[PDB]
Amino acid sequence: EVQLVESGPGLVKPSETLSLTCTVSGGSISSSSYYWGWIRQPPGKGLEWIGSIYYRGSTYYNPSLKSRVTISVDTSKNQFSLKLSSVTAADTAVYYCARHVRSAYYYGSGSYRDEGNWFDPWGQGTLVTVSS
Amino acid sequence: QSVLTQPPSVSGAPGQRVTISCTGTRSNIGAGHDVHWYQQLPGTAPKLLIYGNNNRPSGVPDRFSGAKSGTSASLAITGLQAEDEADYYCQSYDRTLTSYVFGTGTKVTVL
């Protein structure tokens, strides 16, 4: 009942910043403890966590990639945007945005485990190719 | 290390029990923050299959179970059914990387 939609350009030059959108519905990114994240998946490889935001403007990026990753929110339109700086053909991959309902599984320890395990609603995903 | 380690494939014929192992570190599977499992049809949005080591979202057959010990975990699907033709990934939070780290994943075919 939750919907996420990624939008953007298929070809982003290396060493720039890409901004992709992810319009959602069924929840507000203003809801207490809600998160919006980005995850990448290289061809035939595993999932890679990129980032998450917070209705409180708190945000988390992969420590090793923090300086190159940027996430922003727009509560009015219920959208999450993912910006990637200093892109390289190595960053070519499928991008997913995802919704996090409030904190973690609140039931079970009282969510006393940082974030339970994960989120809930995944987007369809967008394929982004990086080449010059 | 940055990936949970699974055997690259696990197989069986329709009705068999197929288990998937999932090797992590102290910081994730060991002394970390619990393991979740996902079931996901290739190229399609994944779906949470197991939460909090051992919870099941509604819709996952009771025949899928998870276990963890030390830095290794496994999922067992006991009686492979036609619905079980998918990819399967494990996942767990790693305190050292402070990242939520996925398993390498397994594709099933009902022989």
Add this chain to the structure above:
Amino acid sequence: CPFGEVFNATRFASVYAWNRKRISNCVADYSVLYNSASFSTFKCYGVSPTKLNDLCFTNVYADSFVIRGDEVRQIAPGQTGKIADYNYKLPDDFTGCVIAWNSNNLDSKVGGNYNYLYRLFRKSNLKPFERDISTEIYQAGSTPCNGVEGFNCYFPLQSYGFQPTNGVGYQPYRVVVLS
């Protein structure tokens, strides 16, 4: 007395900030109210509800708060659960009465009525009848909060989401406890 000021009253306090009133030296008719059939719940523990109005007491305590129907079984003498352990706790030896009625039409609001708050986190349980005074943030997780409600360090519970079109288990109820 002013039971009508309690029953025909306008505003009800949220469970985190329930309302205590002392009552003495006034004229009350009890079987008119218990038999008024205007409440969804009027259960008396200790005293017999059935016309045991032959008394006049030294003190009367009235604690008012708001819950949902689904949640009424936890608001009871010697009851166990989230609200009692973490929000509002009553002792097992409750010699009193509890009345409650669905006030959906009076405590709901278009777009949702978000006036009722509940305590969701607490290090301990409530030592017979206290209220939402200190509403700080507590580390309810690994490390110091030092500020803005955040990671492993929060407030109590949110609002109740008492939309007027809710199910009864999800509907607002006003509760008045008389000791």
